[PDB]
Amino acid sequence: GNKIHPIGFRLGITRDWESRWYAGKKQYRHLLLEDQRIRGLLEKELYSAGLARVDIERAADNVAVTVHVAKPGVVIGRGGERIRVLREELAKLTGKNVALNVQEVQNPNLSAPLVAQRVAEQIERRFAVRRAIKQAVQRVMESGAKGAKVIVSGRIGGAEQARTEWAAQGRVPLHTLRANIDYGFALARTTYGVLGVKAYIFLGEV
């Protein structure tokens, strides 16, 4: 049981925050609880679109909420029918004026939490646990990455004894601060318990 989170290891450099709002020592508490039940609701009713980051900013009773997705089409609805429903759902808990940009992740095979989700999705549809990994990495290397690595936990294929499958390609230098390693994690609630999917994508540098 070793090893730090690669994002948290990098926050000051080669990775910046999912929440860029100052607060004093008595708002922070609530501007967080909100901040969170936000993602709690967004992530839950927005899986289809496939959301990577759920970026957020503030400046006193207004909120940015720049959601990044692979399939913008799905958040909008043909015209603007869903994006309305969401701005409306938000302000019922967030007693403030909820702004809301939307972004396309131009290549979703280089968004680690998408790759995780992908593989996690396959696992729940009893797929070939070891080839999923194999393919996923390939796909990620195929879309031009510097390296990748995927890990699945245990009860692989409903087996009685927990195990751990991994695969990787190129470089994934977890100790280099100046690396830029999108990391991502997906669950996978199956008929025979949870599996855990981790995904690492090396791209960056100076």
């Binding site: 290891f9 100052y22 967080l32 901040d35 993602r39």
Partner: protein, 60 residues
């Protein structure tokens, strides 16, 4: 017990000293940093993700 209780701790009680903290996520009594409403665990977690603004690995 940890449902009937996440509920009870929110109710305003007879006597303010019966009152107490709770990790507003990970629903929990002990090591609960009042500047966040966050259990040391459900906290190291967010702190890592970038979901706690300006919070960073300290090293000195």
């Amino acid at each position: 017990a940890r449902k009937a209780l996440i509920e009870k701790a929110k109710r305003t009680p007879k006597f303010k000293v019966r009152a107490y903290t709770r990790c507003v996520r990970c629903g929990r009594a002990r090591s609960v940093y009042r500047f966040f409403g966050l259990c040391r665990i459900c906290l190291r977690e967010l702190a890592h993700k970038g979901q706690l603004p300006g919070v960073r690995k300290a090293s000195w």
